[PDB]
Amino acid sequence: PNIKIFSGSSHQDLSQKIADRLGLELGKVVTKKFSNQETCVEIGESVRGEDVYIVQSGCGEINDNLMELLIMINACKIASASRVTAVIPCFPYARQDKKDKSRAPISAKLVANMLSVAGADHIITMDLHASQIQGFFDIPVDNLYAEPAVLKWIRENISEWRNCTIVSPDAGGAKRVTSIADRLNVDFALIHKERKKANEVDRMVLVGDVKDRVAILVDDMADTCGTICHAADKLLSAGATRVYAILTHGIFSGPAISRINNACFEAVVVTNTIPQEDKMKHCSKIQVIDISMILAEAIRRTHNGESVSYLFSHVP
């Protein structure tokens, strides 16, 4: 079997980068819409007995892209592909990973079941919002970390990183922030927005010392940037000299760009798990860490039957 890399409509630049790093051309696919807005998928080459990797991030037109991915997976399976792997850099519906409300769906589990029934044999993803999403499948799920790339960026772009403090913008980010602070041998802090019992002012509590130090906000994603912007205001109010925000998934939906442009961030750093070209044109603060080499190495090692553990300590 040979590696066949197919791109959905979501992140075709990332698919191209992965294919170039693998020394391959992208597989021939026409991914369009019928007139009635139904997804049209036209695989333009044989995938018989091939090791098919479909790159599709959960971003942009989320349901459009997920349906595109499912249809492409099913087409490859019925076309007798040896193995179909869904490379989903940003897993859609990952934040709907539990039922903590009455009648609430576990949409991440539904997406996992849909991918399984479409015929996916393997999932490659980066920085799942909850790592337990790996357990939502009965197939192997690669949950790659952007943490080595984040550490590289911090050590190369922040002069006073050895005296910095890594800040969690919410309680759920504590593990990620503590891991990064341990790897950098720096202090960490946590910011919590307390629960909205009524319609008074949202107030943020900070635990840890950030006074007269550079604060690096690290989180898994910035959708509306309410979390990171509120954390940034709190950090400046607490005496932080400079505030950075580093995310792996830059969704930047809704008012995020205006929020960041009016915030105090020295830089907002995201990976290219989601296309950022449009976002960077309206926000100069955004910088992008390319993770295409990580995904390409993961695909290559999956095809060659080699461990991907190397990707959790080094940036290829």
Ligand X SMILES: Nc1ncnc2c1ncn2[C@@H]1O[C@H](COP(=O)(O)OP(=O)(O)O)[C@@H](O)[C@H]1O
Ligand Y SMILES: O=P(O)(O)OC[C@H]1O[C@H](O)[C@H](O)[C@@H]1O
| Contact positions vs Mg ion (CB under 5 A) | 170, 172
List binders of ligand X among 89-118 (CB under 6 A).
95-96, 99-103
Burial label for 143, CB within 10 Å (0-12, 13-18, 19+), is middle
Among 219, 274, 297, 298, binds ligand Y (CB under 6 A): 219
| Residue 28 in marked binding region | no
Check binding of 239 to a copy of itself (CB under 8 A): no
Report the nearest approach of a copy of itself to the CB of residue 231 (Å): 14
How large is the C-alpha radius of gyration of the chain?
A: 20
Report the nearest approach of Mg ion to the CB of residue 132 (Å): 9
Which residue of this chain has its Cβ atom nearest to Mg ion in the complex?
172
Check binding of 223 to ligand X (CB under 6 A): yes
Strand partners, 55: 7, 87
Please tell me whether residue 81 adopts helix, strand or coil conformation. Answer: coil
| Residue 138 in marked binding region | yes
Report the nearest approach of ligand Y to the CB of residue 34 (Å): 9
| Residue 129 in marked binding region | yes
Among 142, 169, 173, 297, binds ligand X (CB under 6 A): 142
Cα–Cα dist 297/22, whole Å: 8
Check binding of 61 to a copy of itself (CB under 8 A): yes
Cα–Cα dist 103/273, whole Å: 31
| Residue 99 in marked binding region | yes
Letter string b/e over residues 169-202, b meaning 16 or more CB atoms within 10 A of that residue's CB:
bbeebeebbebbbebbebbbbbbbbeeeeeeeee
| Residue 95 in marked binding region | yes
Cα–Cα dist 226/238, whole Å: 18
List binders of ligand X among 156-175 (CB under 6 A).
172, 175
List binders of a copy of itself among 91-130 (CB under 8 A).
92-93, 96-100, 102-110, 113-114, 116-118, 122, 130
Check binding of 264 to a copy of itself (CB under 8 A): no
Q: Return the closest-CA partner of residue 239 out of 274, 195, 189.
A: 189
Check binding of 36 to ligand X (CB under 6 A): yes
What are the structure tokens assigned to 254, written together?
């809704």
Cα–Cα dist 219/283, whole Å: 19
What are the structure tokens assigned to 295, written together?
């995904």
- Give the total residue count for the chain: 316
Cα–Cα dist 169/30, whole Å: 41
| Residue 223 in marked binding region | no
Over the window 3 to 42, marking each residue x when it contacts a copy of itself by CB under 8 A and - when it does not, the resulting string is -------------------------------xxxxxx-xx
Among 26, 67, 236, 264, binds a copy of itself (CB under 8 A): 67
Kindly tell me which of 129 and 213 has the beta carbon lying closer to ligand X.
129
Q: Return the closest-CA partner of residue 203 out of 175, 238, 166.
A: 238
Check binding of 60 to ligand X (CB under 6 A): no
Per CB under 6 A, residues contacting ligand X are 34-36, 38, 46, 48, 79-80, 95-96, 99-103, 142-143, 172, 175, 223, 307-309, 312
Per CB under 6 A, residues contacting ligand Y are 95, 169-170, 172, 219-227
